[PDB]
Design a binder for this molecule. Structure first.
Ligand SMILES: [Zn+2]
Ligand SMILES: [Zn+2]
Ligand SMILES: [Zn+2]
Ligand SMILES: [Zn+2]
Length: 306
């Protein structure tokens, strides 16, 4: 076929990044593969997110439309890095007529955790690529909350993703974008943090615009508790040894705006009060015969905005 067992490929993960992997099982019906990575973890990966190595004997055929047919207006261009060939019109945006580097390779170089490269040749090149989407946005089918689509197409990259796991939603097109694919963030994203106003490159026709929304103490409590729940894979967290230290030691990264006006000696009481006041959000360890100062979420769900 196109993919076989034991084949080494590049798989795009839900963080928008590429990882080396080996195909273990091929499902031609659902078009997914069981892929094993370097840390011996195994996950299902859609075929659209699997990049096979270019063949030395697959000379000048479009890796997208598979045709060798060439026409004046639409020539074939070979990527300098991955050696895959594209028709000029089978690449988004249009590949220039002939040191060209294709969209995925541009992303593979520029994308970094905490945000992609912000300045440099590859940073400017990715911005150019990010002016367009490699998929039809209006063709996507969303759930009720506009959190996920059945195509599993997100972001500038077109890769998979979970909205709550380091992604930002554009206020204009309502699409979700990977942290690693953005170039506008100064601090790392927390899990489930929607307290942003974000607008993508496509909607602006240029650089992204991002703004931090003002959090309340109940938001801080909920966000930290949710973020730690996901990170640490557990429900209950000690206030004095886990919750408060995370908040205080990482205070600047949390971008809490006006809350920085609160005297540092008071921060503990404000946060703890929020945890004890909203019994509809937070459950105390007392409810299961443990420490009163143990707290958790009733439902491990992100902090609601407003
Ligand atoms: Zn992405
Ligand atoms: Zn083509
Ligand atoms: Zn390439
Ligand atoms: Zn947008």
């Amino acid at each position: 076929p196109r993919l076989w067992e034991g084949q080494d490929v590049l798989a795009r993960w839900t963080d928008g990044l590429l990882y080396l992997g080996t195909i273990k099982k091929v499902d031609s019906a659902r078009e997914v593969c069981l892929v094993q990575f370097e840390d011996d973890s195994q996950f299902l990966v859609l075929w659209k997110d699997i990049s096979p190595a270019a063949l030395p004997g697959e000379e000048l055929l479009c890796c997208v439309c598979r045709s060798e047919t060439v026409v004046p207006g639409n020539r074939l261009v070979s990527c300098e890095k991955c050696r895959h060939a594209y028709h000029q019109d089978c690449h988004v945006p249009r590949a220039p007529a002939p040191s060209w580097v294709c969209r995925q390779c541009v992303f593979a170089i520029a994308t970094k955790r905490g945000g992609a490269l912000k300045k440099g040749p590859y940073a400017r090149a990715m911005l150019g690529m990010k002016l367009s989407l490699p998929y039809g946005l209006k063709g996507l089918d969303w759930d009720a909350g506009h959190l996920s689509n059945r195509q599993q197409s997100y972001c500038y990259c077109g890769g998979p993703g979970e909205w709550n796991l380091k992604m930002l939603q554009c206020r204009s097109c309502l699409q979700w974008f990977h942290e690693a694919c953005t170039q506008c963030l100064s601090k790392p994203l927390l899990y489930g943090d929607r307290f942003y106003e974000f607008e993508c490159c496509v909607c602006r026709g240029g650089p992204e615009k991002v703004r931090r929304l003002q959090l309340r103490w109940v938001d801080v409590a909920h966000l930290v508790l949710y973020h730690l729940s996901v990170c640490c894979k557990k429900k209950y967290f000690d206030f004095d040894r886990e919750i408060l230290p995370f908040t205080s030691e990482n205070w600047d990264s949390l971008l809490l705006g006006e809350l920085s006006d609160t005297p540092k000696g008071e921060r503990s009481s404000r946060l703890l009060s929020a945890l004890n006041s909203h019994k509809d959000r937070f459950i105390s360890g007392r409810e299961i015969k443990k420490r009163k100062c143990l707290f958790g979420l009733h439902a491990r769900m992100p902090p609601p905005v407003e």
